[PDB]
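User: Hi! Is it possible to get a structure for several chains at once, not just one? Here's what I have:
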Amino acid sequence: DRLKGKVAIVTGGTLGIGLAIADKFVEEGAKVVITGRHADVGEKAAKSIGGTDVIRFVQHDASDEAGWTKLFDTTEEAFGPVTTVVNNAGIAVSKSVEDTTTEEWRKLLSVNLDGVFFGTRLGIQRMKNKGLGASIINMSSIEGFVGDPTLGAYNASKGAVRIMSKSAALDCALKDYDVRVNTVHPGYIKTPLVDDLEGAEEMMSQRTKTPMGHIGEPNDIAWICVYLASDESKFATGAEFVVDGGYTAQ
Amino acid sequence: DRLKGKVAIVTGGTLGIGLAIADKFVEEGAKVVITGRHADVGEKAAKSIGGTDVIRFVQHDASDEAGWTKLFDTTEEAFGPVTTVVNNAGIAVSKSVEDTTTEEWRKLLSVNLDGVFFGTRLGIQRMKNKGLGASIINMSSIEGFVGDPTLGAYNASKGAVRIMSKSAALDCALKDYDVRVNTVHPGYIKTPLVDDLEGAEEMMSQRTKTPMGHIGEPNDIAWICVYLASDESKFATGAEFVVDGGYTAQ
Amino acid sequence: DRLKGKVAIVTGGTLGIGLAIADKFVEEGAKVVITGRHADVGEKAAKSIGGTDVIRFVQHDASDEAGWTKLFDTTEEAFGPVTTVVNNAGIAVSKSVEDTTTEEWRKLLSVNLDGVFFGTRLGIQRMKNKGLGASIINMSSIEGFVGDPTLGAYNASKGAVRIMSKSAALDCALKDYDVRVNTVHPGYIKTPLVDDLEGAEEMMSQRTKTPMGHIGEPNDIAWICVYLASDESKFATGAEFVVDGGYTAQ
Amino acid sequence: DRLKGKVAIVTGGTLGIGLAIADKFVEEGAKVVITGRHADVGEKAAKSIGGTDVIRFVQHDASDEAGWTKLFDTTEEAFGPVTTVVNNAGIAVSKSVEDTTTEEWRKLLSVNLDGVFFGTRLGIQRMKNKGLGASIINMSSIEGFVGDPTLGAYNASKGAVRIMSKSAALDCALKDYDVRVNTVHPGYIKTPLVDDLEGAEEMMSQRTKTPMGHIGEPNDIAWICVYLASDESKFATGAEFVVDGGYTAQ
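Assistant: Yes, the chains can be modeled jointly so their relative placement is included. Here is the combined structure:
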């Protein structure tokens, strides 16, 4: 019951980290809408967690600005006022800054940065001043703290989310909106996508990358998000929560 | 049951933040030893939370090196192998660096830095390689991230705890000790000690200090510590968890 | 002679911080191209510093991608191979995240983020592997470290520049390109634009903002940039250089 | 002439980084006292740089509190009012936190932390309010930002110096003392001591440690210190200057 009465939107909630967030949110009493681009994947995902009284799928691209106010409307029609937004949708490009095409740059930032902006802006507008204990959780990454030579655009996007989220936190706090904004920074997490890339998990598990010598699992990110969505974290805003197996500590 | 089977030492556990940590740890199924310097205060504190099957007081000064191995022994005799160490004992001096006497400097660092060292060193030795999901939680502060002109020695101590804890995290991770080490960084928290200092809460509540416009409460720190003691945070090590009402975000 | 033989592009070099960078670069022996959007302003600016053997103006909007390869060509025709890129062009919007229009968001990021990307990408391509002691200096801000509730899009842009620059630094270092990339983070700096905004300097000079109790001057930023452009800083890459009167220290 | 009229104390100035700081300070017009524990080493060092009109050696252990006011007196008798303090003396212990003896802990912190405290406190007292453009430069390390599993006590000391220095910066700024305080954070630097440790330079030069693929040289640290001692950096206080070949960027 740690999220009793909460109503959450989890973007990119049909796979991996987002799916586990949705799963644990439902376990703790939240009602959840998960979004993703692909209907079959999303319908399967929602039903794996529960019925439509607690979780529903909505097809939506986080870069699709006009769809964001309809996503809130759909969620509120189902479950009542939204209390919790998890901006987790994202894509990656494996290119150095030097090698990044302008098309790649723009495509990644449209999802990873503009999408988070859209969800944060709308979340503040739709949740402020309602006594909801509202919480916006923006998914950055270890790549919001340190560079990676092969993730130039991705680093730009995660650094942007990191600091934009502080701006939003501060404005909400100063205006007594009853909305908190925080960032979560996963290290490497095992998912089917990582499993599809030969040698990725082993590279990420080297001690010079992850000191624990293995990578994490989606529930590792889910539980920090439960904390941040709950009223347990009512004094936490503007902060960065790193769950990375020691990656950034060395 | 989030801390089912855990056995925790909480130093400075008889007052304020430490007491609330102990309280929520017991609520979540841990057995707890709280320490403090004053018997009447500690006995009262323990009994306010529960009986001796779940919480006991041990009189101990965290600067007292020889008492630390006896504290572990006392805890283990009561409750079995220690799994969780919260190094929370600390003192403060209201002096600029310029105005700090060498006696003040040494006294504060003996508690705030040497005490954390003692507890961390011994915790690693006594908890490693036992499959306990062991967790050391070192209490830093917002004053481990930013300076305060009137807290020179206190800033030195909290910066030291911040980075020493990363060293310990990394060594434990690299050696597969099954011990995690993390730091918690409270902002201003309302306690009886703050209440005794006329004008302190209002000064700390100004928006230029705490953007939320009020200070926190001890349970705000307790709940992040429950997360960090639990197996929910098994991929978090070497990281800094800030609960400060936005203080460090601006 | 600290920049003897260097050839620099300084974007937004016709005003304020950029102009002072150009001025001190010329003083230390560099040849400089300054860019800006307005011809009268730029021609005046260049001639205030020196003749066309040491400084020239090129009209260019940093968001204008196709103009960037012609800017390098123009600079090299004048002065020989470019060694130093200062990505300083930028704009600001005074809006919270909540209040930012999508048009404002896109306009600011086109200059502040895409422009820095363009200059960094091209700088690496055009300066690598030539033995030039090449240096890319990306202008972030104190708003790349901390939020400001009224600068949402600006914060996103500066956080992005901060971390993207580390990616670029690392790729250049790992590949032995002989290109360094670093960020500079000015605090508040007195300029004619600040002078035009009634009450701005006094607001920025309050101790709760800038602990020194006054704001800086453009030369304060110029001298850190001279260090970073020079071979004196040949071991500095991937780092953040903060010149802010103490703003971020509290 | 970048340090014309400055009078500097450089602790641990007889070897390595400290010696190069002293060398470049003299080159730029400063008068310098270098300290160290060993007379033959210090006398040789001073004379290698210049005569007694510009550089002198004083035997002093930075942990020796009573010697610090006599060091200032000796310096002022020679050269007039001290303007610049570089707290560079330090020792290292190669032990994990777990393996650190209390004697090792205390010995290292007596030099690395107490010595910096002594020099900072006295520097503020002796240089404030004199119109000197005074500057205190505290030598931290990359080990003030990230952990190293084999440098537990050293990490504690450098984290402490990092944040204590911000306290001192802020107090000086708020009181208009005309004293700035900043930290310098070298990465790995080649010295005779590193050369004496078989395999150290190669270990430190691996790309997973230093992305540039080689370590630095003492002059790399000297030039950032010249910037910080000069009036060029009159708006820089409370900040961290990292010269590390990319170590902390990844």
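Chain A touches chain D through six residues (CB under 8 Å). The domain at 7-249 of chain A is CATH 3.40.50.720 (Rossmann fold).

User: Great, thank you!
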